[PDB]
Chains A and B, each alone.
Chain A
Amino acid sequence: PYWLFVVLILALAGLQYRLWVGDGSLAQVRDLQKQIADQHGENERLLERNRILEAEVAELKKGTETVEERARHELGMVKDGETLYQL
């Protein structure tokens, strides 16, 4: 008998609530793990993109390939002989 059963049931329900849902739960642990994985993937993508842009800047400091590519892409120009095909 005793009210200890009621007290233990209430405490167990409250602690299971705080354990499975809410702040500091296992659900938030899974969230944060998913966020860690997503942010790590984003970090790899960003650190590759930064290297690519750094190399592009370095070639800009001495080369003309980037200028040619940008002129072809944005401005739509074309070298001698032309014969531009569009669709």
Chain B
Amino acid sequence: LFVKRLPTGSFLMLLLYIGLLLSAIAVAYSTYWNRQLLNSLYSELSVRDKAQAEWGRLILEQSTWTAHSRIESLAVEQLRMRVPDPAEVRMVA
């Protein structure tokens, strides 16, 4: 009876569709990668918060062992330290 014909921009439409497919696949994999990186960053931040909790515990433990009153008393009574007088200290420049 008759014959059909593909649209003139068949190759252009095929290239556009291939680009659309590649963009959609890239979007899906990018979203998956972003979620994986979010999980990894959560793990890193959990490690950081664990380290900071340990540091806070160590600071609390050091606080009883380090204070101005206790340090001064140990320096004077035990280490025989002395505060230099303004005339005694030789200052440079």
Contact = CB atoms under 8 A, between A and B. Distances in A.
Direct contact of A and B (CB under 8 A): yes
Contacts, number: 151
Contacts of A66: 66
A78 B13 CA distance: 85
B51 A61 contact: no
B48 A8 contact: no
A69 to B, nearest CB: 10
Interface string B32-74: 0110011011001101100110110011011001101001101
B interface SS class:
helix
Interface residues of B, number: 53
Interface of A: 1-2, 4-5, 8-9, 11-12, 15-16, 18-19, 23-26, 28-29, 32-33, 35-36, 39-40, 42-43, 46-47, 49-50, 53-54, 56-57, 60-61, 64, 66-68, 70-71, 74-80, 82-87
8 contacts: A11-B20, A15-B20, A25-B30, A32-B37, A32-B40, A42-B48, A71-B81, A82-B89
Interface of B: 7-9, 12-13, 16-17, 19-20, 23-24, 26-27, 30-31, 33-34, 37-38, 40-41, 44-45, 47-48, 51-52, 54-55, 58-59, 61-62, 65-66, 68, 71-72, 74-75, 78-84, 88-93
